[PDB]
Homo-oligomer: 211 residues x 4
Amino acid sequence: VHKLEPKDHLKPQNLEGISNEQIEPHFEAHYKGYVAKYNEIQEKLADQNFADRSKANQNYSEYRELKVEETFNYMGVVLHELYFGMLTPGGKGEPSEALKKKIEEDIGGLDACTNELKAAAMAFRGWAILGLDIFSGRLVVNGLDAHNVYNLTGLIPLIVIDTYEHAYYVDYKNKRPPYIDAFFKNINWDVVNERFEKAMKAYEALKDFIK
Amino acid sequence: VHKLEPKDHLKPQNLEGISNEQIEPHFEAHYKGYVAKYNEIQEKLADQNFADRSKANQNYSEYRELKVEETFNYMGVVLHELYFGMLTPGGKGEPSEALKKKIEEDIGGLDACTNELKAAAMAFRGWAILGLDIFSGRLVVNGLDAHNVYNLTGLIPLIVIDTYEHAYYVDYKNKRPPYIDAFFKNINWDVVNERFEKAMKAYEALKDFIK
Amino acid sequence: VHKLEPKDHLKPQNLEGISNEQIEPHFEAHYKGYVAKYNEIQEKLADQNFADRSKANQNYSEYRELKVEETFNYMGVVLHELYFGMLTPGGKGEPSEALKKKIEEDIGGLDACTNELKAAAMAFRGWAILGLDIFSGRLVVNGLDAHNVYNLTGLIPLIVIDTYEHAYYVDYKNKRPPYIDAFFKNINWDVVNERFEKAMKAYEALKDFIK
Amino acid sequence: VHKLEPKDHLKPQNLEGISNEQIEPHFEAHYKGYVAKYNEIQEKLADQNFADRSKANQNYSEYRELKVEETFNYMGVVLHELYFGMLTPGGKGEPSEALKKKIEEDIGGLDACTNELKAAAMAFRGWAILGLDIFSGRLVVNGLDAHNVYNLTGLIPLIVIDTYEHAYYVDYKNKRPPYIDAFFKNINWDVVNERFEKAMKAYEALKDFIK
Ligand SMILES: [Fe+3]
Ligand SMILES: [Fe+3]
Ligand SMILES: [Fe+3]
Ligand SMILES: [Fe+3]
């Protein structure tokens, strides 16, 4: 089966506003837990007798349940890697001119975009994502209620904010706003800018996908 | 606001196993209904007073509800366009050698892939999708329980099967299997092959997205 | 295990506005399908080795998936039995004075209640229910997006309307409004009135549940 | 409109294994937040122009969104009141003989029931409930992934365990098992026994609900 292993090199440390105490369980327990479960699902999915494809049924079937949780755990892995990977103590770099221009024409400006992201982060129960919609070529804010609920198909993630309670409860308890501000203070723009460059290059090959 | 309009040129006709009687309400009522509602949401989202961003709240807020249904309706539009757009009476072309090779190494073969797709179509309440996962560069089968439930972020769709009851109830009533077979008989491989080419070119710019 | 068997005596026939052609697959395929799957889940849940309780995990575990679908299928059974059981050709009886009075004080009147029910039936993707909320002792309209999504705990169902597409697609295709009107024409008020009497008697023992 | 107010007298203090620091935000912020939002929804639902019933639509409509979140917030209120209301420092009383006998015949014994509850609490993302199913007259364990997801219609709650992360993150961080044990140490059996008595009396009026 196609198994995954955690990327320890992605673990943030000494962030401004987000303690190591908060990072520890988030990275070591939650993130790694999704990796472990995804692997279990892969093993069971590989067993044609356990996940019998001929018994596939929408009311209940081993195959169905495995596929349902596969999206939950895989997204749990991916989203966390995108989240931790873009955090550096005190932040780094700045959004590129190309990124600023796109945000300006699609969202209205950096000010409008930040407000939009904070709003989505406050309105959603799982994640708030700023990404490129490959179907329209526009930057969009996608809010998720869970790792696998409300995700837009095809979206290339640029900025990912975890709004699950475990992401901020150690430091801020019920107070989400100060956590969102802290997240913005530690954004590694070198990472985001690179993601954008790749996203745009990819979009050039994907334009007019639906004709 | 960014409004959409239906793509009438995508409407299939005289399909083998899928009647015009079945296609009519699916295209004219359902598909166009998602376009209309998406547009309404865009207008309301543009009104900063109605969708007050400062009032964003996860328990309930006008902003939240609009963003939630935005994903439902937008995916409803996109998925339907990908669905209708790949159907031609009696089918057309054949899967490219490049596509067959990728399926072979990622899924195990055309036989394994067809079985996998039919299984997902039988196991899921909304859609069954074969697409390219930009995070691993592998073809994967993604089942959805609704337009916006269980979608994998970043997935580039190649083959999309609608499993909503309105998609086959006119012709087959509760019988989904014969509908799935009929779908396979009308696949326009020229469309799918092109999608694959673009998907692979896009992946080349996206490889090593997470480092 | 605690198994169930379909209640064939509940099958409606010769309804006004709802054909036998529509009733057939709904009762014989869908309803009975939920009974069959619920039974399978019960058998697997009884096997302590398959549904290992010590391995219970929220990301994925055999125990979890079985419990998730148990609610889907059991509600599928119960809701359908309440639905079919209250339909008689051309309708029967009338709402009791006691029922009318409660509706009047809780909802505002029969006119307001009918409008409320039709609205919920049009707004929800699964079911529209008029029932007694045991926590407040008030009649409330509860809309569900699926058999097990948005259900209010403790609610005693009086009137249940199926809004799943399979419930009306044979007769009305995408047109839900005429189906809702037809449903109201075949309501067996003797059944509903009895449900109400029992619900109220039950509420008398349940009042002040939360102190 | 029918508004609600928090029940301050339900706030637990000096629990064994669950600190006041943990209780504070749970009761003062989360619980009271659901009460506030439910009230807002009631006001907006009362405005026939805002929540226009004639515009009821399942893709999106003000009426729909309000009804969706109404279940989220109302259940948030009710479930929390049942949760806090059954907690006393060090626990109190013991399960009645009547309760023990029912558990014995329906579940298999106190030992089996405790194991079942802990399993459901570990397998579900929102709540784990032991209640009386009015349709079968049997005690059942109902797991929920959220306040309004997977709830069984008609269920009369006896024991309610909150598994949301905010319920235990202050004291145990990611460690849910020790929290579940602590919950069992503070159960006020006088409350549970009374709930059971009322539930059984109610069931006597509800037996043979579906005929
Ligand atoms: Fe997280
Ligand atoms: Fe469709
Ligand atoms: Fe149905
Ligand atoms: Fe809680």
